Each structure stands twice: as structure tokens, then as C-alpha cells.
């Protein structure tokens, strides 16, 4: 969940206030309130987002030639479903025996 949480954080921080910070210098229309928006969300947010993007870019780069990140690809998960099928068949047989017993009443 590490990479998933990192991607979620990057997505939530993708729409930073840098794109909306283009109306911060015009806040001085009362004297020669929210003037603090021109400092924290002017360029520091964009700088942090770019730093995070660069960090995410420089990963291990595992995938080189073929098909990595496998892990099912194989055995008795199939036979696990088969055992579930055996459980179902036993259920059917128990139901037939119960019907026979009911008829035996």
C-alpha cells in the first residue's frame, strides 16, 4: 500500500494552488486580509510538487526486459477453487441424503 498511498498523495497534491495563485498580487486593493496566500502557495507548493515528482521518477526501475511483478501464475489456487467445488458437491450430496431422510419419515 506504500506505492498506492504515494500515488494517492501525488494525485491529491497534483492540483496545487500554484495554478490559482495568479490572483495574489491584486490583493492589495485596500491600502498603499488574505495576503499570506502570495507567500506559501506562490512557488513553494510548485517546488515541493516538482521535488516529489522528481523523487518518484528516480525509482528502482525494476521492469527491464520481460514480465516482472508476477505472483499468481501458478498452482493450487485453481485447486483451492476445486476444493470449494468439492464442498459444493458435498452440500448437494447432503441435501440429497436429507431429502431421502425426509421421505423416510
Amino acid at each position: 500500500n506504500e506505492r498506492l498511498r504515494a500515488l494517492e498523495d501525488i494525485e491529491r497534491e497534483i492540483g496545487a494552488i500554484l495554478q490559482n495563485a495568479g490572483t495574489v498580487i491584486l490583493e492589495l486593493s485596500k491600502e498603499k486580509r488574505l495576503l499570506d496566500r502570495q507567500a506559501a502557495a506562490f512557488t513553494a507548493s510548485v517546488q515541493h510538487v516538482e521535488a516529489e515528482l522528481s523523487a518518484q521518477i528516480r525509482y528502482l526501475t525494476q521492469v527491464a526486459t520481460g514480465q516482472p511483478h508476477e505472483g499468481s501464475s501458478y498452482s493450487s489456487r485453481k485447486d483451492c477453487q476445486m476444493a470449494l467445488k468439492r464442498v459444493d458437491y458435498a452440500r448437494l450430496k447432503l441435501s440429497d441424503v436429507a431429502r431421502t431422510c425426509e421421505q423416510m419419515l
Partner: peptide, 30 residues
């Protein structure tokens, strides 16, 4: 007496099988 005992054993086995299959209804929650 033999018929009564047979009926009793049949009812006991039926109840046991019923109780057994009933508790393992949704063993696989899935």
C-alpha cells in the same frame, strides 16, 4: 421394538446430519 429402534436411530442420524450441514452452510465466506 426393532422398528421403533430403527426409526429412532434414523431420526437421530437425520438430525445429526442436518445440524452438521447447517453450521457449515457458508464456511467459504468469499
Amino acid at each position: 421394538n426393532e422398528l421403533q429402534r430403527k426409526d429412532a436411530l434414523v431420526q437421530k442420524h437425520l438430525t445429526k446430519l442436518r445440524h452438521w450441514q447447517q453450521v457449515l452452510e457458508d464456511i467459504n465466506v468469499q
